């Protein structure tokens, strides 16, 4: 059912993220791992994003979404929730859209394209399709590895979750 469909989709997108393989002298590009998008970048139809959306009852979430269009008339995106139950195509300002990385950074060759320990990030929380504030706990050591993060979580006395794993596809700047 829907729960499996979602979890599978998430794995597909995490696993198929291409690894950046440069040669000597090349630097990792914008949207490789932690390297930010260029100034005034516009994401393309089909690109995955974190999208800040307000529900009808006012609740704001950063959701996993896919770009449908961008209008240069209004400087607004349309994005679709990757979940079929999210039936509203959202019109969003640029500040409400963060492109996901388009390459994984190889920690063995381009560690500067990884987030640093204790950096604040938005990261996809397990069993969800949404992004929440977290601190990097450990970067990946090898290309297959997830980040470990500590989510902000008021249900813990010290305000943080235990370490939880999040793929490079799903960790962006906050």
């Amino acid at each position: 059912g829907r729960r499996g469909v979602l979890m599978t989709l998430l794995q597909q997108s995490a696993m198929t993220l291409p690894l950046w393989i440069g040669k000597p002298g090349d630097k990792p590009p914008p949207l490789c791992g932690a390297i930010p998008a260029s100034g005034d970048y516009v994401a393309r139809p089909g690109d995955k994003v974190a999208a800040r959306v307000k529900a009808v009852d006012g609740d704001e979430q950063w959701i996993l979404a896919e770009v449908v269009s961008y209008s240069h008339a209004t400087n607004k995106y349309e994005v679709d929730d990757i979940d079929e139950e999210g039936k509203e195509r959202h019109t969003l300002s640029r500040r409400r859209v963060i492109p996901l990385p388009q390459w994984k950074a190889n920690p063995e060759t381009d560690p500067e394209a990884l987030f640093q320990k204790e950096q604040l990030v938005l990261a996809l929380y397990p069993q969800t399709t949404c992004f929440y504030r977290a601190l990097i706990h450990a970067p990946p050591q090898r290309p297959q590895d997830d980040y470990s993060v500590l989510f902000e979580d008021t249900s813990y006395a010290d305000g943080y979750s235990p370490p939880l794993n999040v793929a490079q596809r799903y960790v962006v700047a906050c």
Binding site: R3, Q61, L64, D81, Y125, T128, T129, C130, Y132
Partner: peptide, 8 residues
Amino acid sequence: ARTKQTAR
């Protein structure tokens, strides 16, 4: 979307 509030 599936939120944390729903997950937990």
